[PDB]
Design an enzyme around this catalytic site. Structure first.
Site, PDB file in Angstrom:
ATOM      1  CG  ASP A 128      -0.594   2.382   9.867  1.00 19.91           C
ATOM      2  OD1 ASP A 128      -1.372   1.697  10.572  1.00 19.91           O
ATOM      3  OD2 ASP A 128      -0.040   1.934   8.836  1.00 19.91           O
ATOM      4  CB  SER A 188       8.102  -0.450  -5.107  1.00 22.37           C
ATOM      5  OG  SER A 188       7.029  -1.205  -5.650  1.00 22.37           O
ATOM      6  CB  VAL A 189      10.554   0.281   0.183  1.00 20.42           C
ATOM      7  CG1 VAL A 189      11.741   0.833   0.954  1.00 20.42           C
ATOM      8  CG2 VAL A 189       9.295   1.021   0.564  1.00 20.42           C
ATOM      9  N   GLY A 239       0.808  -1.215   0.000  1.00 23.11           N
ATOM     10  CA  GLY A 239       0.000   0.000   0.000  1.00 23.11           C
ATOM     11  C   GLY A 239       0.842   1.265   0.000  1.00 23.11           C
ATOM     12  CD  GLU A 269      18.077   7.705   9.765  1.00 21.82           C
ATOM     13  OE1 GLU A 269      17.286   8.687   9.873  1.00 21.82           O
ATOM     14  OE2 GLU A 269      18.736   7.229  10.722  1.00 21.82           O
ATOM     15  CG  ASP A 292       9.521  -5.219  10.451  1.00 26.79           C
ATOM     16  OD1 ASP A 292       9.339  -6.084  11.326  1.00 26.79           O
ATOM     17  OD2 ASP A 292       9.083  -5.351   9.289  1.00 26.79           O
TER      18      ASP A 292
HETATM   19  F1  LIG Z   1      13.979  -1.628   6.373  1.00 23.14           F
HETATM   20  C1  LIG Z   1      14.729  -0.720   5.770  1.00 23.14           C
HETATM   21  F2  LIG Z   1      15.301   0.135   6.598  1.00 23.14           F
HETATM   22  F3  LIG Z   1      15.665  -1.331   5.068  1.00 23.14           F
HETATM   23  O1  LIG Z   1      13.864  -0.027   4.902  1.00 23.14           O
HETATM   24  C2  LIG Z   1      13.445   1.255   5.106  1.00 23.14           C
HETATM   25  C3  LIG Z   1      14.321   2.270   5.442  1.00 23.14           C
HETATM   26  C4  LIG Z   1      13.809   3.546   5.601  1.00 23.14           C
HETATM   27  C5  LIG Z   1      12.452   3.788   5.413  1.00 23.14           C
HETATM   28  C6  LIG Z   1      11.553   2.783   5.072  1.00 23.14           C
HETATM   29  N1  LIG Z   1      10.258   3.021   4.889  1.00 23.14           N
HETATM   30  N2  LIG Z   1       9.747   4.303   5.050  1.00 23.14           N
HETATM   31  N3  LIG Z   1       8.379   4.109   4.781  1.00 23.14           N
HETATM   32  C7  LIG Z   1       8.160   2.800   4.502  1.00 23.14           C
HETATM   33  C8  LIG Z   1       7.001   2.129   4.178  1.00 23.14           C
HETATM   34  C9  LIG Z   1       7.049   0.771   3.931  1.00 23.14           C
HETATM   35  C10 LIG Z   1       8.248   0.085   4.002  1.00 23.14           C
HETATM   36  N4  LIG Z   1       8.209  -1.246   3.729  1.00 23.14           N
HETATM   37  C11 LIG Z   1       9.353  -2.130   3.837  1.00 23.14           C
HETATM   38  C12 LIG Z   1       9.552  -2.520   5.295  1.00 23.14           C
HETATM   39  C13 LIG Z   1      10.239  -3.889   5.352  1.00 23.14           C
HETATM   40  C14 LIG Z   1      10.386  -4.357   6.798  1.00 23.14           C
HETATM   41  N5  LIG Z   1       9.744  -3.414   7.709  1.00 23.14           N
HETATM   42  C15 LIG Z   1       8.370  -3.008   7.469  1.00 23.14           C
HETATM   43  C16 LIG Z   1       8.203  -2.550   6.021  1.00 23.14           C
HETATM   44  N6  LIG Z   1       9.389   0.758   4.321  1.00 23.14           N
HETATM   45  C17 LIG Z   1       9.356   2.094   4.567  1.00 23.14           C
HETATM   46  C18 LIG Z   1      12.105   1.523   4.923  1.00 23.14           C
END
Ligand SMILES: FC(F)(F)Oc1cccc(-n2nnc3ccc(NCC4CCNCC4)nc32)c1
Length: 274
Positions: free
Chosen positions: A136, A20-21, A17, A90, A97
């Site tokens: 959230d 793409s990261v 949602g 960053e 997570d």
């Molecule tokens: F996990 C990492 F640090 F490598 O990735 C980042 C680093 C910095 C910011 C983010 N963000 N910022 N908003 C996001 C929304 C979703 C997202 N999804 C990938 C993550 C993978 C593992 N943690 C929860 C989601 N990453 C985000 C993700």
């Protein structure tokens, strides 16, 4: 293009949602970064910077909180493309997570949960201070800097400017949303946040969230599936009061007996992460 030359793209970290990261590096100083793409058609909430430019609300909110140091993920840069926006964020390394962390560890030791929860509170206080409501808060939207033992809040894509009047829109996570949203589609910012903090704290000390269904949220009856101290149970139940005005303020949470004598981030890492 200023995006493709300033940054070196790595593996996709996730998609959903939020867009793409990607993992990435700033080419100049090899700083690790995250590169987040959002399609314009998929964007629901727009905002505006001080000047004319219309941007995703997320960019607005991130700029309001991304000043100075904090337990909030820093926005380093952003770019507009014809059909999308690209955010540069960053990236701690190594990182995990809190959702994955709890998956691997199960229910957290209270000492560890106290340290994590404390840092989440300081981050949320920081956001509210900067006029930003995250909307959230949950384990997936919290990153752990494993070396430093510092937590970092991410994903302001469901957020809003903080206001004192009622909210009637919500697109965050339902199982973390308060009973007044479920029943009336109305909530106020701080007390809805405190509810979600209660869910988060339960999640940490029990290894799972307390409610799955609308009816459970509405009933607000908390059953502890894991051994939890009486003081911790009391704090959780207070955050999860059914009447919004019955919930604690951030100040009352941090002055709670359970919140005393928190560990520093680095010793948290030494004792629990290293
Ligand atoms: F996990 C990492 F640090 F490598 O990735 C980042 C680093 C910095 C910011 C983010 N963000 N910022 N908003 C996001 C929304 C979703 C997202 N999804 C990938 C993550 C993978 C593992 N943690 C929860 C989601 N990453 C985000 C993700």
């Amino acid at each position: 293009e200023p995006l493709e030359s300033q940054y070196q793209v790595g593996p996709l970290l996730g998609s959903g949602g939020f867009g793409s990261v990607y993992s990435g590096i700033r080419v100049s100083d090899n700083l690790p970064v995250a590169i987040k793409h959002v399609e314009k058609d998929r964007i629901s909430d727009w905002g505006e910077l001080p000047n004319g430019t219309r941007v995703p609300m997320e960019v607005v909110l991130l700029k309001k909180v991304s000043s100075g140091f904090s337990g909030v993920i820093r926005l380093l840069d952003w770019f507009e493309r014809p059909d999308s926006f690209v955010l540069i964020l960053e990236r701690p390394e190594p990182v995990q997570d809190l959702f994955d962390f709890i998956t691997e560890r199960g229910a957290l030791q209270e000492e560890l949960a106290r340290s994590f929860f404390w840092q989440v509170l300081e981050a949320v206080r920081h956001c509210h201070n900067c006029g930003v409501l995250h909307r959230d808060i949950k384990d997936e939207n919290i990153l752990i800097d494993l070396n430093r033992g510092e937590l970092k809040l991410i994903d302001f894509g469901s957020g809003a400017l903080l206001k004192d009047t009622v909210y009637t829109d919500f697109d965050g996570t339902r199982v973390y949303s308060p009973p007044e949203w479920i029943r009336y589609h109305r909530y106020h910012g701080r007390s809805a946040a405190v509810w979600s903090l209660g869910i988060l704290l339960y999640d940490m000390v029990c290894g799972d969230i307390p409610f799955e269904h609308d009816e459970e949220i509405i009933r607000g009856q908390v059953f502890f599936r894991q051994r939890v101290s009486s003081e911790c149970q009391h704090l959780i139940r207070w955050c999860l009061a059914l009447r919004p005005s019955d919930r604690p303020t951030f100040e009352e949470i941090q002055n709670h007996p359970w919140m005393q004598d928190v560990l520093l981030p680095q010793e948290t890492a030494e004792i629990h992460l290293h």
